Design a protein around this nucleic acid. Structure first.
Ligand SMILES: [Zn+2]
Ligand SMILES: [Zn+2]
Lengths: 98, 168, 54, 95, 57
RNA sequence: AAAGGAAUUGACGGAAGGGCACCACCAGGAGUGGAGCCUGCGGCUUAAUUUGACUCAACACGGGAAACCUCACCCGGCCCGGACACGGACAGGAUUGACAGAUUGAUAGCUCUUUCUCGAUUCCGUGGGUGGUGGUGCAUGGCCGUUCUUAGUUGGUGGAGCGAUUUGUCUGGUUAAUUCCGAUAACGAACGAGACUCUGGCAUGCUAACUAGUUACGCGACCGGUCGGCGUAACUUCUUAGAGGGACAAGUGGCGUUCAGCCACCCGAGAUUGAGCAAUAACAGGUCUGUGAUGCCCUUAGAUGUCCGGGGCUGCACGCGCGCUACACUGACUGGCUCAGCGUGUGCCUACCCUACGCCGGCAGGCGCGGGUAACCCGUUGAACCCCAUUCGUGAUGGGGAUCGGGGAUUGCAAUUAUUCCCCAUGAACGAGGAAUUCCCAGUAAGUGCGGGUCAUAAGCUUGCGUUGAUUAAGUCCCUGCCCUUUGUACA
């Protein structure tokens, strides 16, 4: 019961590496339960635009999304080293616990 | 331990301070940006520069010095950082490198207009579609004003200014 | 001076206990998520951290 | 400034230990981060490095309230003479 | 008026006033950070060593 | 050394004519202006009441809700953090620290009395510097506001002119829009608009899952039904979120130089969802108080650096503005009942956190075991208004809760000029506000609460979230601004 946990700020690299990891685990046919899409946390900081406070008080709205996914599989726990060597694309980082 | 959000924020502050410090040291090197790639055998930091021979110093003194100062300042461990230099293909399509080149021409001193027209001519000869250079300040006499140097076409609004327009 | 009264004031729990992590100012800080920058240094480096207007 | 000789030679031995120097703008930190043992203050390091700078022995940058110090080769022979060394021993930037 | 600065006061060759010639001319400071030559100044109602800031009587 | 003639572009008018916009009126709603109160600004006082801003484009604005720090500002004192070089000094010691006692507001070797420690880093004058939230945003950048989010702006070849320059970019129709149709010495284009990104609305069709649920079961508890009550096997309706699909004025009727389009109606989740982005080019617009962005001037050791301490920005014969709370019977007060949603959560620097549950109090709270770095624990987020019964009965009344007394707790080094909270007491104008005026067109105004910010304590402000949810318009240039065309100039 080893669960690999993926996190990024963009959806497309995370979707490519999750598709590649389930393709590498469906080619060897371990039991893989599919990607479980955890809800996105928006970090929003709403600051004022003007550096001295003189104008017509227009406000500025920043945000950043965190996309949080996982794959869970039942296997021997040293077979699991060979799948996480194809997943080294930037953005997405991998946290593994048992 | 620490949150996912505070981890993402603190790594973003690491990108910000690393690019700001590398701009403040490396004016001469053709510094345009940095590239982090982290694997737990060795954490790899890739510098974008157009001239590597000023990145190294004396037989590679300043790149091992740069490895040492990033190891010292951010609290990095003994032997997890090594430092590379990637060659950028086009200097005329990176605004940071050409912004430093115009800065170095005008700081080493030239007419402002022949500097800006050499930059606009090289950018339109490198294969871009367009350019715009504003050099503003105390240009002629003691009263400041705007001087704009354009050639070709430019897109100004919408979402395609985020991936078709390079600025500095 | 004396090292029993010089900087003897508590620099816990204050507006002088916190400052900008870039530009040494203490006013109009953004304290959330461990940024600790003031608002101007947020707006310079905003897309460099990844906080993007959308 | 009037410091002990031991904290001063620990400062100069730190600069010969790694080759570079970073301080943290701190007037009011009681101890240095690397130099808590050997009891060095941070004001000692910052004004010791300005006394190095005012003769031209170190190259300085300041970014994000962090100092950076890059030693000249005048400082290489000066730390071969002030710290008392065998002549085949090099700093870690040259190894 | 004005607040004056402090100048280092000059007793002249008191280095033989730590001894009497075999036999010392002032009394010893008990210490572990001091000792092996460190004495206390004997004032009229008190006795003073510098580093431990010790008063006797 | 020009005065003058003719002609082009622009600015301007106390000229003529069109056009647009709820930062305009009209249809109208909640209000504001009169009232107590928080808060900013003008004055007035102070030792100081620091400061920038004065029509939108100042006045709940500096994310500025300051008890110390903040902190500039006042009264008194310590401090080199005056870095290097020349010379004076100097191992018969350059000189750092220091007990008792006078001093002080101080357990400041601050200094004076007094006389030990330390041992060339250090002290004396020069030069030169350093530090400044000190000036001048009228020397400047960066960035931001505004003209303006109005719909404007410009090349290439061709025509017109000796020429500056003009047509292209317009009489008209149409558009949210120089958006298009059409006319046509113009033809084809570029920037802005639009396209584009994000969000909202649809899916029994796909992918799907103990940190998410449905349901067929198995058992427990209660008189077939109820169970968020305890655990299993199939599914993806409800939760999450990707990949594509989908709405295009496409279908119909009418109007329409039969052309742009406009109006009406079915099928449909949907027949103008909302925000970001933002051109030519300019203002003596604001910001040297975000900056180790700064140019020069200033001060630079009886400092405008820098620290510690009391004080200040909070003062009030007085104005102006943002706001809150109400002037009650659709109400007030007491009990019951039942429902959200954006999100926050243990920290390089650095002490600062969300809180379950049990015990003790009428509260703020006290005390302990727990959980949580998050779809896991707080959390089914048992939110307020709204709903259902009790009482009150038009009274300045049980509305109004301003001002004002004693007490308890929390934070913190410290609450006086009450920070906050709760107990009890006290009952001021105010009964719906005059000339002027502010804001607004569908989940909109408005009513009502809950998160984020600032924060050791924390919201009458701001930024979002939802909930209950309408009247009125489907247009005009009368008013107020603005753009455009023709026109006048001795204005540039
Ligand atoms: Zn910020
Ligand atoms: Zn002693």
């Amino acid at each position: 019961r080893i669960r690999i946990t993926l996190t990024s700020r963009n959806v497309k690299s995370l979707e490519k590496v999750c598709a590649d990891l389930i393709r590498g685990a469906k080619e060897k046919n371990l039991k893989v339960k599919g990607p479980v899409r955890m809800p996105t946390k928006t970090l929003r900081i709403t600051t004022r635009k003007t550096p001295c406070g003189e104008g017509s008080k227009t406000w500025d709205r920043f945000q950043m999304r965190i996309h949080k996914r996982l794959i869970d599989l039942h296997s021997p726990s040293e077979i699991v080293k060979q799948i996480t060597s194809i997943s080294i694309e930037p953005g997405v980082e991998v946290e593994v616990t048992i | 331990q620490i949150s996912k959000k505070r981890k993402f924020v603190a790594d973003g502050i690491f990108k910000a301070e690393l690019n700001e410090f590398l701009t403040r040291e490396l004016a001469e090197d053709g510094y345009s940006g940095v590239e982090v790639r982290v694997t737990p055998t060795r954490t790899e930091i890739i510098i974008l520069a157009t001239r590597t021979q000023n990145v190294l110093g004396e037989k590679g003194r300043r790149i091992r010095e740069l490895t040492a100062v990033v190891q010292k300042r951010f609290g990095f461990p003994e032997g997890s950082v090594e430092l590379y230099a990637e060659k950028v293909a086009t200097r005329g399509l990176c605004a940071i490198a050409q912004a430093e080149s115009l800065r170095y021409k005008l700081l080493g001193g030239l007419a402002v207009r022949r500097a800006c027209y050499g930059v606009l001519r090289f950018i339109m000869e490198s294969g871009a579609k367009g350019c715009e250079v504003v050099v503003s300040g105390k240009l002629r006499g003691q009263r400041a004003k705007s001087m704009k140097f354009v050639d070709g076409l430019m897109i100004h609004s919408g979402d395609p200014v985020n991936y078709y327009v390079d600025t500095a | 001076g004396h090292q029993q009264l010089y900087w003897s004031h508590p620099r816990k729990f204050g507006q002088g206990s916190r400052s900008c992590r870039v530009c040494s100012n203490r006013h109009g800080l953004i304290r959330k998520y461990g940024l600790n920058m003031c608002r101007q240094c947020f707006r310079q480096y905003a897309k460099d951290i990844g906080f993007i207007k959308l | 400034m009037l410091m002990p000789k031991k904290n001063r030679i620990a400062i100069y031995e730190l600069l010969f230990k790694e080759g570079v120097m970073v301080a943290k703008k701190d007037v009011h930190m009681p101890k240095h981060p690397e130099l808590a043992d050997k009891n060095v203050p941070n004001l000692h390091v910052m004004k010791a490095m300005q006394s190095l700078k005012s003769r031209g022995y170190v190259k300085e940058q300041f970014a994000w309230r962090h100092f950076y110090w890059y030693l000249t080769n005048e400082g290489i022979q000066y730390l071969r003479d002030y710290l008392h060394l065998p002549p085949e021993i090099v700093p870690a930037t040259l190894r | 008026p004005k607040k004056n600065k402090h100048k280092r006061k000059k007793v002249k060759l008191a280095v033989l006033k730590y001894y009497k010639v075999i036999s010392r001319l002032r009394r010893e400071c008990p210490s572990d950070e001091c000792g092996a030559g460190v004495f206390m100044a004997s004032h009229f109602d008190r006795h003073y060593c510098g580093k431990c800031c010790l008063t006797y009587c």
